[PDB]
Amino acid sequence: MYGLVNKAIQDMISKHHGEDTWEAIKQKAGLEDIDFFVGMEAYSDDVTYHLVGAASEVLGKPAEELLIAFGEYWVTYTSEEGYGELLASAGDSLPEFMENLDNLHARVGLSFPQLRPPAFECQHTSSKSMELHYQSTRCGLAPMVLGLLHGLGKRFQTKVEVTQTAFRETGEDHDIFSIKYE
């Protein structure tokens, strides 16, 4: 994944646990070769997996718990690191933002030529609810989606409930989330 993601994980950890813990995690991930992450450069996905793996061990939290926190964090972090306007242009309510998600990543795709974005499809069920379909070339990021969704609730001062109803891991085609909103 592009360095932007790894910088943000690094950032999240450092803001919450200081530079000491970060160097520990960096060490255990097998990444002391790397002085700093470069925002617009492509890294091996393994760099992120090893990062989440390490932070899990060092912090005593499960990976999935961290993916959830990171998901929330990403919504705030992107607006402060170059992407406020793009976010503002993706909608002024959660259901709208979700519809615009593939379009948003297309936009990002222009700056980031090697992007491997997720695909998201909304099937509405009422004015307060929807099925979100999440398809990816990567495994086990569904917990991140959950956090992103809550991050967006926080963004649009909107109450959301998110429940995964289908799991790649059980053998289903793709992850599906049922979502209810204010």
Ligand code: HEM
């Ligand atoms: C301006 C805001 C955003 C930017 C700049 C951005 C950019 C990115 C980038 C660079 C990646 C890594 C993909 C790669 O390197 O191949 C990514 C991944 C991802 N993004 Fe976004 N993103 C934004 C907002 C969002 C939001 C709000 C969601 C909410 C669903 C989202 C969903 C995801 C997911 C689930 C992934 C994991 C990749 C995968 O599933 O394979 N993104 N995004």
